[PDB]
Amino acid sequence: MQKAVEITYNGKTLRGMMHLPDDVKGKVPMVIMFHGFTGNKVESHFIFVKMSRALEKVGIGSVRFDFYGSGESDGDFSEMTFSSELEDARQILKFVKEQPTTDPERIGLLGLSMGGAIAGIVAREYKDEIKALVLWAPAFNMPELIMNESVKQYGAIMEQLGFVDIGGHKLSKDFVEDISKLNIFELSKGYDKKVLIVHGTNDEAVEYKVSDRILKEVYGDNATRVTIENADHTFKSLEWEKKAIEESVEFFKKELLKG
Amino acid sequence: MQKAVEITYNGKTLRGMMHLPDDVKGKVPMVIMFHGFTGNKVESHFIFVKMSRALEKVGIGSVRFDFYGSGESDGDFSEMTFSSELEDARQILKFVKEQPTTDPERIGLLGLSMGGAIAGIVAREYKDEIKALVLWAPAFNMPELIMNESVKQYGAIMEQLGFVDIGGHKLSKDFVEDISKLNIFELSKGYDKKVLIVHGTNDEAVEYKVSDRILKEVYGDNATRVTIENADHTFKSLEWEKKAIEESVEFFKKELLKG
Ligand SMILES: CCCCCCCCCC
Ligand SMILES: CCCCCCCCC
Ligand SMILES: CCCCCCCC
Ligand SMILES: CCCCCCCC
Ligand SMILES: [Cl-]
Numbered sequence: 001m002q003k004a005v006e007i008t009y010n011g012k013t014l015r016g017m018m019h020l021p022d023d024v025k026g027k028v029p030m031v032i033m034f035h036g037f038t039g040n041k042v043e044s045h046f047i048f049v050k051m052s053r054a055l056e057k058v059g060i061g062s063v064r065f066d067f068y069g070s071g072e073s074d075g076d077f078s079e080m081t082f083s084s085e086l087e088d089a090r091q092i093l094k095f096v097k098e099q100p101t102t103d104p105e106r107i108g109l110l111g112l113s114m115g116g117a118i119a120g121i122v123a124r125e126y127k128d129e130i131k132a133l134v135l136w137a138p139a140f141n142m143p144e145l146i147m148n149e150s151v152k153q154y155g156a157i158m159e160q161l162g163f164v165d166i167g168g169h170k171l172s173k174d175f176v177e178d179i180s181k182l183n184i185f186e187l188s189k190g191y192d193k194k195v196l197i198v199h200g201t202n203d204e205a206v207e208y209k210v211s212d213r214i215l216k217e218v219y220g221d222n223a224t225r226v227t228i229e230n231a232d233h234t235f236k237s238l239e240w241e242k243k244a245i246e247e248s249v250e251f252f253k254k255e256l257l258k259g
Numbered sequence: 260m261q262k263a264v265e266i267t268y269n270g271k272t273l274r275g276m277m278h279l280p281d282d283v284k285g286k287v288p289m290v291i292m293f294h295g296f297t298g299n300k301v302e303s304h305f306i307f308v309k310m311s312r313a314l315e316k317v318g319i320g321s322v323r324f325d326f327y328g329s330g331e332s333d334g335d336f337s338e339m340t341f342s343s344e345l346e347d348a349r350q351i352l353k354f355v356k357e358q359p360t361t362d363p364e365r366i367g368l369l370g371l372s373m374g375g376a377i378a379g380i381v382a383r384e385y386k387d388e389i390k391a392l393v394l395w396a397p398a399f400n401m402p403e404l405i406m407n408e409s410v411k412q413y414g415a416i417m418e419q420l421g422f423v424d425i426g427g428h429k430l431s432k433d434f435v436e437d438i439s440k441l442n443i444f445e446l447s448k449g450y451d452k453k454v455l456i457v458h459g460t461n462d463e464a465v466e467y468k469v470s471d472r473i474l475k476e477v478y479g480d481n482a483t484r485v486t487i488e489n490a491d492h493t494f495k496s497l498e499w500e501k502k503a504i505e506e507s508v509e510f511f512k513k514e515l516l517k518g
Contacts (some may be wrong), residue, residue, distance in 0.1 A: 002331075004263030004274070015263070017331060037472060042299055042330050044428030071301050072261075072276060072308060165497045168304030238424045 002052070005037035005063065007095050014074040014088060016065030017040055020101055024059050029061040029106035029131075029256035031055055034089060036113030037138070040071030042168065043112060044234035047241050048081060051110070052250045054095065060108075060256055065092050070211050078163055078170035079153055082114070082142070083176040094111055097129075105131065107258045112136040113233065119171045122217070123195075130174050132255035133195045133250045139186040139206045140214055146176055150210040196251040197221035198244050200231025264322065268350050274331040275300055275324030275351075275398055276328065277461060279312040279360055283318045288365035289391075289513035291356050292323040293381075295372030295398070297428055297483070299330030302371060303493035306500055310369070313508045319367075319515060324351050329360065336424060337429040340437040341401070342480060347437045348381050356388075364390065365515045371395040372492065379447030379477070382454075386471070391514035392454045393507045396492055399443040399473055405435055447477050454482035455510040457503050459490025483510075 001022055007014040021028055030159025033051065041064035042049055052062045063251045069080030078242045096102050104120050109130055115139025123133045139145070149155060154164050160176055197210040213215035226247045231240040260279040280287055292310065294302050300323040301308055311321045314452060325332035326347045328339030355361055368389055370378030375397025382392045398404070408414055416423045421432045458470040470484055485506045490499040 002274075020465075038304070040301055042301070045297070046299070046330060046336075047427065071305060103446075167495045168306065168493075168497060168500050170497060213285070234427075236426045238427060238429060241427050 001054075002182055004009050005095075007064075007065065007091055014068060014092070014218075016063055017049075017052070018037065018061070018063045019056045021056050021059045021063040026101075027103040028059060028061045028101055029108065029252075030099075031108040031110055031252055031256070032089075032092055032096055032154070033062060033064045034085075034109070034111040034115030034118045035048070035064070035067070035070070036115045037142075038077075039112070039115070041066050045078070045241065047234065047237060047245070048112070050241065051245050053223050053233045054245050056104060057087055058249060058253050058257070060249075060252055063092065068223055071098070076170065078172045079111050081172075081175045082117075083178050083181060085118055086121060089118050090125075093122065093126065106128070107133065108132045108252050108256050111138065114139045114142055115194050116140070117142050117184045117188075120184060121189070123191045124188050127191045127193070130191070130193065132193055132252060133191065133259075134251060135197045135214070136235075136244065136248075137196065137199055137203055137206045138197065138210070138214060139207065140188070140218070141210050142184060143179050143182055146179050173223045185213065185217050188214075191219065194251070194255050195219050196248060197223060197225040198228065198248060199225065200228045200233065200240065203233045205233040215256065234245040260315075260383065262485060264324075264354070265428060266324065266350050266354050267269050271327050272333040272348070273324045273327060273347060275322055275474040276308075276311070277320070277322045277358075278315050279320045280315050280318045282309070285360070286362040287360060288319045288344070288367065288511070289358075289361050290319060290321040290369055290511055291348075291351055291355055292321060293344075293370040293374030293377045294323070294326070295327070295370075295374045296401075297329070297425065298371070298474070298479050301324050304495060304500065306493065306504070307371070309500065310504050310507065312510065313504050317508055317512050317516070319508075319511055322351065322355055329355075337431045340393050340431075340434050341376075341441060344377055344468070345353045346489075348377050351387065352381065367391040367393065367434055367511050367515055369393040369395065370397065373398045375399070376401050376443045376447075379443060379450070381427060382452075383447045383450045386450050386452070389452065391452055391511060394454065394456045394473070395494075395503060396458050396462055397456065397473065399444060399477070400448070401471050402441055402463065403408040405514060409435075428499070444472065444476050447473075447503075450478065451481055453514050454478050456482060457487065457506060458484065458489045459492065459494060459499065461489050462492045464492040504515070
């Protein structure tokens with residue numbers, strides 16, 4: 001079962017998709033997926049859609065929304081900050097918890113790239129009601145990656161205009177000021193339930209070493225990593241995306257279906 | 260107004276978005292937008308959503324669906340052919356024609372890249388009921404671009420496997436067999452209503468010369484070209500995207516809001 005859904009708060013409408021298992025009756029586990037920077041809820045080569053349908057096959061529902069300023073949701077990219085996507089995510093969690101078909105004890109979070117940073121922080125904020133966490137190429141170093149651009153041509157334009165063009169998207173100086181005050185590693189530490197990190201070794205956006213840092217600095221024994229050998233940032237191949245999906249589904253199967 | 264919509268036919272379910280003006284009610288003009296190859300209804304840097312919202316502002320509604328096999332719609336990419344997207348497009352036009360809010364005399368088509376090839380053929384096939392046509396970087400040379408790979412590494416893989424991996428998408432030999440029989444230039448020739456072609460000079464996917472071929476071989480004086488100087492294939496900058504959308508909205512405003 002796949003059907004479009006809508007969230008509205010503070011005059012903002014978020015547009016998303018919800019999947020529920022056809023066979024199962026009653027309350028089901030739910031995985032919430034957060035997309036990345038300039039991405040949307042379908043994500044690269046439809047990997048989020050494929051992930052939703054793979055979960056549905058094992059009895060696990062899901063929702064995927066576009067953050068405010070991206071995709072089908074309301075707003076322009078220039079209004080978005082990392083913190084405004086955090087507040088979207090809290091509203092998305094609230095939406096899921098309030099669905100009559102949700103098992104509130106079996107809600108999982110999944111995030112890709114900057115969406116992995118969102119997922120890690122929301123997991124920590126709601127550590128007693130998020131059952132499991134999956135991080136795909138999580139951009140915990142997003143603040144550094146943005147600040148590194150301030151000394152390049154982006155920084156000079158930003159100073160003249162208050163925004164920069166990142167390729168058909170208006171990135172506001174508000175985004176830079178907001179993210180420069182955040183430490184994703186610190187804000188994510190303290191989540192004690194099971195974590196799965198999926199990272200490709202040839203990731204040129206979020207270098208593979210970031211997953212080393214997350215295993216070392218953020219989590220304890222509750223986190224394990226699936227390394228996709230030679231894969232790029234979004235697992236852009238049939239074999240790579242299949243490994244990413246299948247490992248994440250089996251992980252969510254283990255953590256959300258029993259206990 | 261923006262809302263999710265569905266079409267179910269021949270066991271296939273297509274999923275899309277419909278926009279209606281808020282400030283003008285009753286029967287309104289409608290623009291159907293077709294996305295490109297491996298794209299989806301949001302399209303590159305959300306340009307289709309931005310287009311839908313810019314049309315709303317001038318009193319023009321729109322729909323945009325994911326083709327079967329792409330995005331939010333049903334199906335695997337390996338099930339898709341150019342001809343199956345053409346049949347999708349026929350069902351989308353039927354859907355639009357059957358909405359009570361649609362002015363049946365004021366329906367326009369827009370297509371990007373391979374979606375532009377879809378729009379050109381559909382406009383010609385329904386030439387007496389499509390009031391205006393907008394082509395963005397139209398991939399009328401799609402058959403040649405596919406057959407050009409038959410002598411490259413893709414061709415050798417295709418022969419061994421019956422499909423190729425184009426980056427997390429499975430492209431079937433059925434797609435190759437189907438498109439090798441199609442001449443998009445010939446199938447679009449004869450549409451006599453107004454046409455706008457928008458093309459970037461630095462397009463490296465569909466070379467700008469293709470627009471020269473379309474102006475010469477496909478349409479008469481009813482076609483006009485807007486050249487976006489120095490732009491790439493999907494107008495990936497704020498200024499390029501702004502020009503593409505503004506010129507296309509003013510064209511649809513002139514052609515659909517007449518009389
Ligand atoms: C406009 C290009 C859309 C993606 C085409 C990909 C073809 C195979 C590239 C390796
Ligand atoms: C592959 C053909 C490209 C034609 C446009 C080139 C623009 C400068 C790179
Ligand atoms: C992982 C890349 C996301 C888009 C970045 C755009 C600015 C370089
Ligand atoms: C920008 C860092 C990239 C690290 C992986 C490089 C693989 C060729
Ligand atoms: Cl949608």
